[PDB]
């Protein structure tokens with residue numbers, strides 16, 4: 001259960017103060033909803049149900065032409081009001097937003113800056129150098145007191161891997177922050193909407209009315225609203241961190257959220273639409289370099305584990321008993337361990353326990369199998385910290401802090417379990433990563449982000465996605481080989 | 489009409505000599521078809537209709553397990569017969585192939601070689617350096633007399649951009665070869681099947697029988713058959729080139745065929761399955777570096793042309809007459825030309841001709857519009873060599889060798905045409921690129937690939953995909969703006 005993750009952040013029915021929002025129906029461009037501050041930004045009152053005309057909205061022919069083409073987002077520089085206008089499509093609606101235009105900016109200056117970044121990335125000595133250059137560029141153009149790059153781990157915790165700034169905020173470079181600082185619905189949203197900005201932590205939310213959109217009969221889906229009012233609890237987190245403004249940018253690599261470029265200010269601070277879009281572009285450029293590196297490594301590992309797989313599957317088929325493809329020689333046993341980069345394995349077939357390499361005792365495995373028995377396992381169970389959910393395991397963390405466990409073969413109660421040892425390491429966090437407080441029925445963030453150091457115990461080197469896949473495929477192979485052998 | 493492009497290369501009903509082929513039905517693994525040389529490679533006669541058993545095929549339980557999992561290709565090292573076995577799925581069939589195994593190779597040596605390439609690419613000073621390193625690696629592992637990298641142009645002609653080898657074959661580095669050397673169905677096939685090998689140009693094809701597959705009732709689709717007998721006319725091309733063996737590898741970037749790693753030998757030469765797969769891997773690695781570079785440039789250009797588009801669309805909407813967004817000031821006119829990187833444009837609205845920048849005369853444009861009038865144009869007509877299909881245009885190649893032409897507005901006979909000048913350049917081809925001979929009812933390749941040099945005339949700098957898109961979008965915008973203005 002995750003109460004943080006359950007907040008419906010995409011439907012707050014309000015926006016921040018630095019702009020206004022209008023919802024139009026696609027066919028007619030009839031005004032279906034509006035933020036309470038609309039007439040202010042645009043100088044004309046649009047009653048609900050009324051038809052936007054060119055007199056109200058000088059850009060409406062451009063909006064019309066945009067609507068029916070391919071571009072996902074509308075942009076229009078409304079010089080007269082010094083407003084930047086943006087829009088997106090949602091169902092049968094157009095959601096239109098306006099904000100103050102940038103001052104003293106040009107497309108041509110931003111293009112030269114991004115071109116230089118692209119060229120630098122297109123050589124790119126090293127990823128580290130690519131990350132620092134990208135943070136420095138974003139810092140230069142956004143004017144924020146701090147810009148960092150936040151790299152997500154397999155558990156959705158993250159480490160600060162690059163940083164630039166004015167000195168007005170603390171340094172978090174090299175620190176880890178827990179998964180729960182960005183809850184899963186926020187992570188999902190941030191996968192599909194790559195930009196956000198909070199220019200003043202203490203804005204007063206501006207209501208969107210009417211509450212119910214008459215075209216849809218539901219509340220407004222603000223997933224792609226740039227002005228969307230943000231979660232109260234995140235604002236509390238910002239206050240606790242001492243950041244009066246933020247802006248972040250998703251780094252999306254091969255369709256998955258790789259990390260964030262996160263920016264903060266010690267006082268209120270906004271960034272123009274053109275500069276936000278340039279920061280997205282910068283993140284995309286960086287993502288291309290990251291991808292080169294990520295995919296080469298991943299693919300190489302899959303090739304490697306494929307070779308080991310081919311040998312195991314061949315020996316399993318050639319042997320009288322499939323198990324001897326795993327246990328029947330020194331190469332077989334070495335390959336068994338290498339298949340997932342483990343240091344040990346138990347093959348448990350009914351009452352026969354066969355321990356290979358470095359394992360817990362028979363007695364420890366039997367207890368572990370009883371413990372596993374009581375869970376639903378789709379294909380494989382994997383953990384890098386078995387003591388975490390199975391405390392009796394702390395007694396054998398030196399050999400089996402990490403496990404991949406799975407049922408195998410045609411016999412219920414037969415398992416293949418791979419083991420990894422504890423690897424102790426010192427981990428420095430931005431504050432106590434267990435510190436969330438429950439109060440008035442809600443989970444609140446920690447108050448301190450001061451370096452919080454631990455000697456991490458009972459935790460193995462993490463299981464990679466190629467190692468998990470290889471486990472799944474081995475499992476599939478064992479049963480398919482068996483099935484076919486049985487046809488005879 | 490393209491008779492070269494019409495040959496059904498994926499259904500020759502025969503294979504090359506260096507392996508054998510068996511078609512199995514998926515459910516039963518019943519033998520549906522076989523190459524005439526099968527019993528030779530595998531030592532057991534499989535009558536058609538008969539059920540493959542483990543005695544015939546020791547790997548059949550592995551094949552069975554593979555069939556029902558996710559992997560696209562089967563591989564099995566049949567040590568006893570020193571055969572490499574491969575397979576793929578096609579409809580309800582499995583197509584299984586066997587060939588001689590490699591001698592004195594290891595997975596671990598190939599992995600170290602590819603890892604070093606990946607690491608080099610993951611810094612990669614320059615694309616040129618990446619291309620040469622990749623050719624050198626492929627040369628090292630494949631043993632071919634020559635390895636080159638062949639980069640496709642927008643017209644599907646290609647230039648040799650890297651090369652390595654023994655000296656036993658000529659150098660083609662820096663030469664261009666015409667589009668018709670690889671016809672469009674071959675290019676399509678090579679987009680989805682990234683590997684091919686022809687170990688001996690003078691092999692005698694081995695028939696697959698029966699002719700009709702009884703499970704499907706049609707001939708065998710050999711698109712993904714590695715042993716497939718190849719087009720006779722390509723074999724003629726190889727003989728003319730003096731290459732007794734070849735192997736090539738597609739370089740696929742963002743789903744499109746970017747180029748080939750092409751290898752040749754002056755005498756017969758084969759490459760093992762493991763080495764072919766390593767060459768595919770090498771091409772994929774290279775593709776990741778190419779992609780970084782390609783996508784950055786493309787994306788930057790789209791941003792740039794987007795900015796110009798936003799200005800044009802805004803001026804078109806603000807003006808009484810949409811045309812003044814294009815003609816109504818110095819910026820408007822500059823943006824009009826810049827929208828597609830042109831040096832000139834004609835906006836022709838009924839009988840009013842408005843020429844901007846460097847154009848042909850009114851009289852020349854009027855004739856051009858008559859010529860255009862007689863063609864079907866989906867959205868835009870674009871060429872980099874207008875004299876090519878419109879010879880009277882040679883008289884104004886200095887100003888309008890290249891054009892993008894399109895109908896615009898709500899009035900039939902209204903056009904926007906952008907112009908580019910001739911850029912003369914010296915082009916060196918691998919033989920006369922117009923030289924194909926018709927004989928006995930078929931098109932044959934040239935006999936000489938000796939450097940063939942021309943001063944290329946009547947040809948502009950080529951139109952890029954972002955420039956074409958920008959033209960299409962402008963066209964869409966003009967009509968949408970007009971439509972909405974008209975609502976009033």
Ligand SMILES: */C=C/C1=C(C)C(=O)N/C1=C\C1=NC(=C\c2[nH]c(/C=C3\NC(=O)C(C=C)=C3C)c(C)c2CCC(=O)O)/C(CCC(=O)O)=C1C
Pocket residue numbers: 003004005007009148150158160172177180181182183186196198229230231233234237246247248260262263436443444445446
């Ligand atoms: C019970 C809920 C939450 C706890 C507890 C908590 O700590 N956060 C909780 C919820 C949300 N956080 C949201 C957004 C968000 N969080 C971060 C986190 C970081 N900021 C940093 O500076 C660093 C590290 C140096 C971290 C790890 C960021 C960057 C963001 C995005 C907003 C921004 O750029 O400031 C969030 C969603 C907010 C919204 O979009 O409505 C929730 C619900």
Ligand SMILES: */C=C/C1=C(C)C(=O)N/C1=C\C1=NC(=C\c2[nH]c(/C=C3\NC(=O)C(C=C)=C3C)c(C)c2CCC(=O)O)/C(CCC(=O)O)=C1C
Pocket residue numbers: 491492493495497636638646648660665668669670671674684686717718719721722725734735736748750751924931932933934
């Ligand atoms: C009328 C048909 C053809 C003309 C004329 C011609 O010149 N080629 C014709 C047809 C086919 N070519 C096919 C394959 C193919 N072509 C090339 C071309 C090159 N080899 C080179 O060395 C260089 C440049 C240095 C070029 C441009 C290659 C590489 C290939 C792929 C085969 C290989 O690696 O040798 C083809 C299809 C063959 C098949 O797959 O069946 C046809 C029909």
Ligand SMILES: [Ca+2]
Pocket residue numbers: 151152153154258
């Ligand atoms: Ca990561």
Ligand SMILES: [Ca+2]
Pocket residue numbers: 639640641642746
């Ligand atoms: Ca190219």
